[PDB]
Amino acid sequence: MDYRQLHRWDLPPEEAIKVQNELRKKIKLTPYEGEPEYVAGVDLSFPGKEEGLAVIVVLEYPSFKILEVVSERGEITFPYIPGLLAFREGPLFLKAWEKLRTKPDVVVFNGQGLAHPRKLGIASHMGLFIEIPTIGVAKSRLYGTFKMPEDKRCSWSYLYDGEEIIGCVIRTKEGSAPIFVSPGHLMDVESSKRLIKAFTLPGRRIPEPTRLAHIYTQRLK
């Protein structure tokens, strides 16, 4: 699948932060109206240390039938730093993306989008490259404040940066920790909440696109 390569990846952390502060200006928080037909999820594993495997799975909606899996292996060259995840995982994701034949309507990443100290988590950053609506779904908080949702399925609360809403926290599974959902690019807070709820089956904590992408990262190892 095609994409735009907006900048080089081999930057020191200080310069990578500056890149984020320019790219954040380019995010578009627009509603996602209607229902998608094809939904992608992305996950990464590390079979060897600093050797990565990126997997993209494309699902049909609402059936969740698997339409495509792509993967790519490569060396990891940038350390994990909270807030700079894209510089670690972005390049290998894009190598998998170039192989993709099915064009998704929405892409879900393991990580934040808007809920990020510079408003450009990996989901937002990659959204700018691929120019398709994206959503970030994370298991823990990077940035923002929130009231803990009720321990009842579908309970949610907003994530705030002061008075600004940057995402939400959703109890997708009663008795389990919630998930952190934030819009990436061409997505807004209300739409990302609605879509992730639609993608998450009752009894499961994790939405089907990234749940299945994780399954394949483990199998392909």
- Let me know: does 41 contact 53? Beta carbons within 8 Å: no
Pick from 105, 50, 94, 69: nearest CA to 214: 69
> How many CA atoms are closer than 13 Å to the CA of 73, on its beta-carbon side?
8
Q: Which of 1, 19, 39, 43 binds Ca ion (CB under 5 A)?
A: 43
By CB under 5 A, residue 168 contacts Na ion: no
Least distance in Å: CB of 199 to Ca ion? 16
Options 35-43, 59-67, 70-78, 191-199: segment touching Ca ion (CB under 5 A)? 35-43
Among Ca ion, Na ion, none, what does residue 72 contact (CB within 5–8 Å per kind)?
none
DSSP state of 176: S
Which CB, 29 or 115, lies closer to Ca ion? 115
Options 7-15, 44-52, 125-133, 138-146: segment touching Na ion (CB under 5 A)? 44-52
| Per-residue contact flags (x/-) with Ca ion for residues 178 to 217, judged by CB under 5 A | ------------------------------------x---
By CB under 5 A, residue 43 contacts Na ion: yes
Options 18-26, 35-43, 66-74, 125-133: segment touching Na ion (CB under 5 A)? 35-43
For residue 62, cis peptide bond before it (omega within 30 degrees of 0): yes
**Tokens 């823990």, residue?**
140
Q: Which of 71, 110, 134, 172 binds Na ion (CB under 5 A)?
A: 110
Helices 122-130 and 13-23, interaxial angle, to 10°? 60
d(CA 177, CA 112): 16
Among Ca ion, Na ion, none, what does residue 214 contact (CB within 5–8 Å per kind)?
Ca ion
- Let me know: does 42 contact 54? Beta carbons within 8 Å: yes
Which CB, 76 or 154, lies closer to Na ion? 76
- Let me know: does 133 contact 124? Beta carbons within 8 Å: no
Among Na ion, Ca ion, none, what does residue 124 contact (CB within 5–8 Å per kind)?
none
Residue 137 in 3-state DSSP? strand
By CB under 5 A, residue 44 contacts Na ion: yes
Binding site for Ca ion (CB under 5 A): 43, 214
